[PDB]
Amino acid sequence: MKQYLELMQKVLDEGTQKNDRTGTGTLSIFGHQMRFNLQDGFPLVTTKRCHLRSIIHELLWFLQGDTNIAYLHENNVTIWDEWADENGDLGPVYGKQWRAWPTPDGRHIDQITTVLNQLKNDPDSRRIIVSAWNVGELDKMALAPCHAFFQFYVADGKLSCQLYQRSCDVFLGLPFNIASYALLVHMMAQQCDLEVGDFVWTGGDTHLWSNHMDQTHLQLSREPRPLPKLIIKRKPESIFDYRFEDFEIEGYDPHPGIKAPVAI
Amino acid sequence: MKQYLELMQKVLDEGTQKNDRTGTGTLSIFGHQMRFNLQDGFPLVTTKRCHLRSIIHELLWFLQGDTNIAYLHENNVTIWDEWADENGDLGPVYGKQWRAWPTPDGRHIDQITTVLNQLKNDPDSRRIIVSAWNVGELDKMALAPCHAFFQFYVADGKLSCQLYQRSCDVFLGLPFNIASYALLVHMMAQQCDLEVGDFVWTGGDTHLWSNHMDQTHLQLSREPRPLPKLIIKRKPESIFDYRFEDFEIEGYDPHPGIKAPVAI
């Protein structure tokens, strides 16, 4: 997509070389923002083939509050394998914080239900927020949250969302993150009888892994194709009741896939 | 400042009317980003005189972990009066979360100490973060955190910081928030033997209050002036040992102060 390729080129043009926790090395910038008007089309990268199946299942898994990879395996999704323990557990990562953030007094907060209720009853609230950044549980998580904090907004009958992504693997992770949040906006908008607005992506440490450079330049040589279109085929009774088969992506005509290794 | 006035004008031009929490009404946009290179000058708004006394004492108060306004009153700072209870308390707002975030099991994390130690021992970390958005304590706070989540970054010997501000009163609040975080970057950089980099400001619901419009038109009629220079006059033993007298803003030549009412 235009915005995505422009980000790649900005990292290449302006980034600094850094060492990192994995020992692989990155090229990084700090601070970026871009916007996807979801009425223009569904923002799934077209300059390489992306695996929408994994994106949808991962989101459904988050929304169930699950943090064990068994469900992903039942559906042949392997994107979290490298970080799970011997029992498949990731610790209290995204799904757990989204559905059951633990408080100091023994309560658990379902942030997804909270935001749906805010959108329905108080859409001009400036507090329609989900955070995965639970400081007190970071040490139990297999990986610290990358997509850390997000906020919803409503104007002119349209639902928007802004994500703060504190760490972004531009080549491998970002196409998944953008599509995931775009899907979530569509689902939330459906549940709240709203149209779709913008997905605003904001990055912190926004980087290209040193061993993704040939792949990145190959992708940059390609012209984006028209965005595909997302069709939802049912309105479930709640945001937690979607199924994989409720979604169809139409008109997705990507350039060939480009393989790259994930840094563990 | 150029970017600040551009944002003001953008809210006027593109903002939509909202009925908010208080019934006063705003013009609002969603999703914006600005960048201030701190080596270009200290980013204190020059198109009106800003009250540096309040900005500095508020930050020192946060760093003490204090959430009672008595310290502010001792120093003739009244910016938090409208939300404090009869004993001067605001609940577990910024200072408490910064210095003593409570874990579900009765422990605490001092996020500021953690950050200092990350900057000194692991400066390439992608996880140098402070969050005030303690979901499990929001209901105890007098006001939900506005400046909610911030991240540090080190490159080429320079310290940068990005703030996610979920709600932004462009006229009254934003000049304070920018100056506050800029000051914090200078203090942290001093304590860690770094130079200053960028302050990146990212906004969510970014608005002008309906009763700030005359003030906004006045300010937009003024041309910005060169930025002042921050001087720190002694280096304390730690980030927790600064005092008001340690700071001097040199070459601050603002247009006159502009008065406007705060929405409670």
Ligand SMILES: C#CCN(Cc1ccc2[nH]c(N)nc(=O)c2c1)c1ccc(C(=O)N[C@@H](CCC(=O)O)C(=O)O)cc1
């Ligand atoms: C974001 C996010 C979710 N996640 C979770 C996740 C966990 C740790 C990470 N670690 C690093 N260094 N980068 C990542 O982006 C990353 C992402 C993903 C993980 C891997 C792939 C990936 O390897 N994709 C390959 C192969 C996909 C497939 O299985 O067919 C690709 O070619 O796209 C995608 C998403």
Ligand SMILES: C#CCN(Cc1ccc2[nH]c(N)nc(=O)c2c1)c1ccc(C(=O)N[C@@H](CCC(=O)O)C(=O)O)cc1
């Ligand atoms: C951000 C922030 C901190 N805060 C905390 C704070 C708390 C609640 C708020 N509520 C609303 N609606 N807007 C604010 O920006 C706001 C800010 C501030 C609060 C008030 C002023 C203020 O009234 N400033 C006046 C007068 C300053 C003075 O006392 O001399 C000004 O002219 O600047 C500034 C900062």
Ligand SMILES: *[C@H]1CC(=O)NC(=O)N1[C@H]1C[C@H](O)[C@@H](COP(=O)(O)O)O1
């Ligand atoms: C993490 C998971 C995600 O959803 N998106 C990403 O892009 N993610 C990337 C970001 C980093 O490259 C890596 C995480 O490592 P750190 O915790 O930042 O050291 O995964």
Ligand SMILES: *[C@H]1CC(=O)NC(=O)N1[C@H]1C[C@H](O)[C@@H](COP(=O)(O)O)O1
């Ligand atoms: C809040 C405090 C701050 O530091 N900056 C701000 O700009 N703040 C403004 C934002 C809103 O105008 C108001 C808070 O009200 P909501 O919680 O957003 O309804 O204060």
